[PDB]
C-alpha cells in the first residue's frame, strides 16, 4: 500500500565532503585512495586507505561537542544533516517530528577512541577515562545525536551487519515507513576505522591490498592484478519518505525504493559464496515485483578481492541468468575503497544519483579484465556512461555471510 | 495478518546458565550480583557486577572455535543454541532453513578483546594482532556463527540500541516474520563488557552504583538509597515463529508477541525523560490493539538510578493513567544487574515465563520505597507472586534516548 521515495541525500567520503563533490569525482573516474596519513601505518602490510579529507565537523555542530565523539559519529551526523537539509524538512512549518525516526548503523563503531582510551589507561590508569568515552563510541548514538538535534521522536536505533550495514538500515527504514511506524526515516551507515587496530585487523586477515607503491590502482575490482580491498571511511545517508507525505509538501523526489532482499550464506565467516548473494538478489527482485531483465544497473559489492569479485559474478549469473550479460555493473569501491558499514550507505546514494542523472559511474583500474576467472560481464570499465536507468540495484555481501540487496526505481 | 509466537527460550546470565536455573533464582529473590572477579577493578569507583559464573562454552562449540571469539559472542551463541534446542527445530525433518533468520544484537560488543589486543600491540606492535581479532569482535558475528552452525539462510544481522538492543532485535524480527521475509527468527541480545574500559567507562559517567561494601543490595530499584545501576553481562534469546508454521508441527507455544513500540526522547543522551518512554508504551499498545487496563504485568527498565527510576514511574503514569496503580511492575535488574544490549533479551524471556507459569518475579532490595520521589506504584517488592498474567509488557529505555516496548500475550 504505502510507497517509499527518497527526498534527501547525504554523503561524506574519500571522493567528496558533499554529494555533489562525490558525484563529480566518481563521474570523472578520480580515485579517493591515497597513502594513510591518519596514523603511522608503516608496520601494517597495507598502508593505503580511502580517507575523508578537508572535512570540518565544526560546520555542522559545535567544536566542543564534536570533541567528545569518535569520527564515525562525525561522518554520520554530517551526512545526516546534509540529507535533512537537502530534503527541505528544516523549512516545513508544523512538521510532525513524532513521525520521524533515525536508523544509522556502523560495522565497527568507535575503534579509534577505544584504542586511544586504552593507551591512556595503560599509561595512567582507569581514571583517565573521559566521562564522554562511552557515549562517544556507542554505535547507536549517531541516531541519538540526530534525533536530539532535530527533535525527532520516531523509532531510532542502529544496525550492525559489517559490509551490509548501510543496506540493512535503509531497507529496514523503508519497512518501518510502509508498516506505518513512521512517515519519515533518516537512514544509512557510517564508518571510521582508519586506526592501528582497524587497518591492522583486516591486514591480519590478509584481506587488504598491499599495493602500497601504487595507491591509486590498489583497488581494482575484476582486474587480473587485484589483491584485497582498500579500507575506507565515511558515511552515506538517505531521507526516506512516504510518497503521499512527500507529494503533499512540494518535495523533490530522487527515486523510489521498491525492493529489499536479505539472505545468509551459512558457509564462511569472511568469504562470500555464490548461492547466498544470489538468494538476496532474487529475494529483492521478488519483493519489488520485477524481473532480472528490468534491471539496468548493478552497483556491485565489488571489493577487489580475488575470490570475492569472481564469486559475485557467478552469483549475478545465477540470479540474472542471461540478462547478466545485458545489464551494466560497476563497483564505485574502485574509487572510494570499501567503506564497510558505510558502504551500503554511500552506494545507495550513488545508485539513486545514477537513476536521477542518467549516468553510470565507472569501475576504474580495469587494465586487464579477469575473464579467465569468469569475470566477463560489462563492469563499465574505466569510463562513465550516459545511460537511461529505470531500475538500479545495489548489492552488499558482508562478513558473517550476511547479504543485502536494495532495489531502486525511477519515480514518475 | 500473520501471527508470531514464541516457541523457544534461551538464557545465560548472572542468575543462571540456563533458563530453568534463572527462572528459579529470580522467583526465589536471589541476587546474581557480587564483587568483580573478572579483572582488577580496584581503581574504579564501581567494583560490583552481575557476572556469568560456572559457564562452559565448550558445551556448545569446540574450544578451538571459542578461542577466536570474544565472550559476548559466547553468551549469544550459547543462548541461541538453547532456544533452538528448546523449540525442537533441530529435530524437524526437511526443515526449510532458507526461511530461518537470525537477529541478535549487542550494545558494545567485543570491548574486552579490543582492550587485550590493544595492549599486545602496545607491547609488541601490529604483528600481535590475531587473524581472528576482527571477526572475534564484530557484533553481527553472533548471527553469523549461528546461521553457519545451523545452516539458516534467511535474513541475518544485528542491531545496536544500547539498553534497548535486545528489545529492538525481537520486535524487528517479529516484523520480519509478519512481512513474510521469514517464518522463523532467532532473536535477542548479548553483552560482555565486564572489563576495564567497560566498567570504567560507565563509572566515568557516574552511572554505576558505588555500594562496593554491600554488593547484594547495590541494585535496588525505586529504593530510597539507590545510587546508579549495576553492570551485568550475558544473553537472552527467543525463537520467534509464524503461528501456522508452529501449529502445523507439534510446537510448544510459550506466548504470542502482539505488539512492538518504538520512540525517541530527543532530549538527553544518557538520561530518560517522561514523554519519550510514554510514547513507546502507548505505541506498543496501539500496535497490539490493547488498552492499558488489560496489562497485567510490566517488566520495567528499572536500572536503580535516582532519576531514571522516578522518571520511569512518571512515564508509566502518563501511558497507563489510573491503571499505573492497578498493574504490577517489577525490575529483575534488582537481581541480574543491567545487561545492557542483552537486557531486553533476558527480560523478554522473564516476561514470557511470567505469562507461561503465572508468576511475577520480585523487585528485591526495596527497604524504603521512594514514595517522596513519586515512586508509589506496586513494584512487587521483595517477594514473588502467583498471578494470572494474560498480557505483559517489557520496557527498555536506553542511552541515546531510544525506547522500545514489547507486548506479549497468552496464546490459546
Ligand atoms: K553496492
Ligand atoms: K524490561
B273 close contact with A: CB closer than 8 A: no
Quote the ligand 1 centre to A394 CA distance (angstroms). 4
Q: Please answer whether residues A336 and A304 qualify as being in contact, where contact means their C-beta atoms are separated by less than 8 angstroms.
A: no
Phi, psi of A291 (to 5 degrees): -105, 160
- From the list A399, A155, A66, the residue with the least C-alpha distance to B156 is A399
Calculate helix-pair angle for A19-27, A343-357, nearest 10 degrees: 70
Report the C-alpha dihedral over residues A110, B139, A75, A245, rounded to 10 degrees. Answer: -140
Phi, psi of A244 (to 5 degrees): -60, -40
Fold category of A5-259 in CATH: Peroxisomal Thiolase; Chain A, domain 1 (3.40.47)
- From the list A363, A355, A408, the residue with the least C-alpha distance to A384 is A363
Which residues on A lie below 8 Å from B167 (Cβ)?
Answer: none
Q: What is the DSSP string of B305-327?
A: -HHHHHHHHHHHHHHHGGGGGTS
Q: Interior CA angle at A222 toward A217 and A225, to 5°?
A: 50
CA distance A59 to chain B (A): 21
* CA gap B50, A33 in Å, rounded: 46
* CA gap A199, A208 in Å, rounded: 8
* CA gap A6, A19 in Å, rounded: 14
* Residue A317 Ramachandran class (φ > 0 left, ψ -120 to 50 alpha, else beta): alpha
* CA gap A141, A145 in Å, rounded: 6
* Ligand 1 ion local residues (Cβ < 5 A): A 299, 347, 394-395
* CA gap A93, B336 in Å, rounded: 47
Q: Please answer whether residues A256 and A289 qualify as being in contact, where contact means their C-beta atoms are separated by less than 8 angstroms.
A: no
User: What are the sequence ranges of the domains in chain A?
Assistant: 5-259, 260-412
Tell me: domain B260-412, CATH 3.40.47.10, correct? yes
Spell out the residues 6+ positions from residue B13 whose beta carbon is closer than 8 angstroms to its own: B22, B32, B50, B52, B232, B233, B234, B235, B236, B336, B339, B342, B346
Same fold, B5-259 and B260-412: yes
Give me the total of CB pairs closer than 8 Å, taking one residue from chain A and one from chain B: 268
CA distance B380 to chain A (A): 30
By DSSP bridging, strand B391-398 and strand B297-299 are parallel
* CA gap B396, B211 in Å, rounded: 24
By DSSP bridging, strand B184-191 and strand B156-160 are unpaired
Query: Which resolution, in Å, applies to this structure?
Result: 2.1
Grid cell locating B256: 504470542
Phi, psi of A396 (to 5 degrees): -140, 120
* CA gap B115, A156 in Å, rounded: 29
The dihedral sign for the CA sequence B220, B221, B224, B230: positive
Phi, psi of A387 (to 5 degrees): -155, 140
The dihedral sign for the CA sequence B257, B263, B268, B274: negative
Count the alpha carbons within 13 Å of B78 in the hemisphere toward its beta carbon: 28
Quote the ligand 1 centre to A346 CA distance (angstroms). 9
Which residues on A lie below 8 Å from B158 (Cβ)?
Answer: 159-161
Calculate helix-pair angle for B71-87, B141-150, nearest 10 degrees: 40
Spell out the residues 6+ positions from residue A54 whose beta carbon is closer than 8 angstroms to its own: A17
CA distance B400 to chain A (A): 4
* CA gap B343, B108 in Å, rounded: 13
Cα dist. B295→A171, B254, B328 in Å?
A: 33, 18, 9
**Residue B55, SS3 per DSSP:** coil
For residue A329, list its beta bridge partners.
A298
What secondary structure, in 3-state letters, does chain A show? CCCEEEEEEEEEECCECCHHHHHHHHHCCCCCEEECCCCCCCCCCCCEEECCCCCCHHHCCCHHHHCCCCHHHHHHHHHHHHHHHHHCHHHCCCCCHHHEEEEEECCCCCHHHHHHHHHHHHHHCHHHCCCCCCCCCCCCHHHHHHHHHHCCCCCEEEEECHHHHHHHHHHHHHHHHHHCCCCEEEEEEEECCCCHHHHHHHHHCCCECCCCCCHHHCCCCCECCCCCECEECEEEEEEEEEHHHHHHCCCCCCEEEEEEEEEECCCCCCCCCCHHHHHHHHHHHHHHCCCHHHCCEEECCCCCCHHHHHHHHHHHHHHHHHHHHCCEEECCHHHHCECHHHHHHHHHHHHHHHHHHCEECCECCCCCECHHHCCCCCCCECCCEECCCCEEEEEEEECCCEEEEEEEECCC
Say whether B263 and A179 touch across the interface (CB within 8 A): no
Q: What is the DSSP letter of B38?
A: S
Say whether B153 and A279 touch across the interface (CB within 8 A): yes
The dihedral sign for the CA sequence A241, A244, A248, A253: positive
B139 close contact with A: CB closer than 8 A: yes
Report the 10 Å Cβ neighbour count for A338: 27
Method: X-ray
**A346-374: string of b/e by CB count within 10 Å (b at 16+)?**
bbbbbbbbbbbeebbbbbbbbeebbeebe
Say whether A157 and B402 touch across the interface (CB within 8 A): yes
Residues in chain A: 412
Count the alpha carbons within 13 Å of A351 in the hemisphere toward its beta carbon: 36
For residue A273, list its beta bridge partners.
none
Q: Please answer whether residues A111 and A193 qualify as being in contact, where contact means their C-beta atoms are separated by less than 8 angstroms.
A: yes
Q: Considering CB atoms only, which of A159, A204, A275 is closest to B157?
A: A159
Grid cell locating A362: 565507472
* CA gap A110, A72 in Å, rounded: 7
Could you identify the residue written with the cell 520521589?
B373
Amino acid at each position: 500500500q504505502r510507497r517509499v521515495v527518497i527526498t534527501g541525500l547525504g554523503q561524506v567520503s574519500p571522493v567528496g565532503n558533499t554529494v555533489a563533490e562525490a558525484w563529480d569525482t566518481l563521474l570523472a573516474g578520480k580515485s579517493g585512495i591515497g597513502a594513510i596519513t591518519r596514523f603511522d601505518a608503516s608496520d601494517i602490510n597495507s598502508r593505503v586507505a580511502g580517507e575523508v579529507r578537508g572535512f570540518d565537523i565544526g560546520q555542522y555542530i559545535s567544536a566542543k561537542e564534536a570533541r567528545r565523539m569518535d569520527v564515525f559519529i562525525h561522518y554520520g551526523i554530517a551526512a545526516a544533516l546534509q540529507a535533512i537539509a537537502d530534503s527541505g524538512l528544516d523549512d516545513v512549518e508544523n512538521l510532525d517530528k513524532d513521525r520521524i525516526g533515525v536508523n544509522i548503523g556502523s560495522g565497527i563503531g568507535g575503534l579509534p577512541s577505544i584504542e586511544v582510551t586504552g593507551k591512556a589507561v595503560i599509561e595512567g590508569g582507569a581514571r583517565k577515562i573521559n566521562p564522554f568515552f562511552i557515549p562517544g563510541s556507542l554505535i547507536n548514538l549517531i541516531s541519538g545525536h540526530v534525533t536530539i538535534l532535530k527533535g525527532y521522536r520516531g523509532p531510532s536505533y542502529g544496525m550492525v551487519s559489517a559490509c551490509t550495514t548501510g543496506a540493512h538500515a535503509i531497507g529496514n527504514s523503508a519497512r518501518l515507513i510502509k508498516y506505518g511506524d513512521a512517515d519519515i526515516m533518516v537512514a544509512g551507515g557510517a564508518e571510521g576505522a582508519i586506526s592501528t587496530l582497524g587497518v591492522g585487523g583486516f591486514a591480519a586477515m590478509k584481506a587488504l591490498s598491499t599495493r602500497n607503491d601504487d595507491p591509486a590502482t590498489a583497488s581494482r575490482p575484476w582486474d587480473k592484478g587485484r589483491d584485497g580491498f582498500v579500507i575506507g571511511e565515511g558515511a552515506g545517508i538517505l531521507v526516506l519518505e512516504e510518497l503521499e507525505h512527500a507529494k503533499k509538501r512540494g518535495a523533490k523526489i530522487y527515486a523510489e525504493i521498491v525492493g529489499f532482499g536479505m539472505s545468509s550464506d551459512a558457509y564462511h565467516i569472511t568469504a562470500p559464496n555464490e548461492e547466498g548473494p544470489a538468494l538476496a538478489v532474487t529475494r529483492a527482485l521478488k519483493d519489488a515485483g520485477i524481473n532480472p531483465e528490468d534491471v539496468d544497473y548493478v552497483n556491485a559489492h565489488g571489493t577487489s578481492t580475488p575470490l570475492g569479485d569472481a564469486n559475485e559474478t557467478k552469483a549475478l549469473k545465477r540470479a540474472f541468468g542471461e540478462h547478466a550479460y545485458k545489464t551494466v555493473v560497476s563497483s564505485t569501491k574502485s574509487m572510494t575503497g570499501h567503506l564497510l558499514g558505510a558502504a551500503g550507505g554511500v552506494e545507495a546514494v550513488y545508485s539513486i544519483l545514477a537513476i536521477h542523472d542518467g549516468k553510470i559511474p565507472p569501475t576504474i583500474n580495469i587494465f586487464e579484465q579477469d575473464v579467465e576467472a569468469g569475470c566477463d560481464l560489462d563492469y563499465c570499465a574505466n569510463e562513465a556512461r550516459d545511460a537511461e536507468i529505470d531500475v538500479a540495484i545495489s548489492n552488499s555481501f558482508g562478513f558473517g555471510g550476511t547479504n543485502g540487496t536494495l532495489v531502486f526505481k525511477r519515480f514518475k
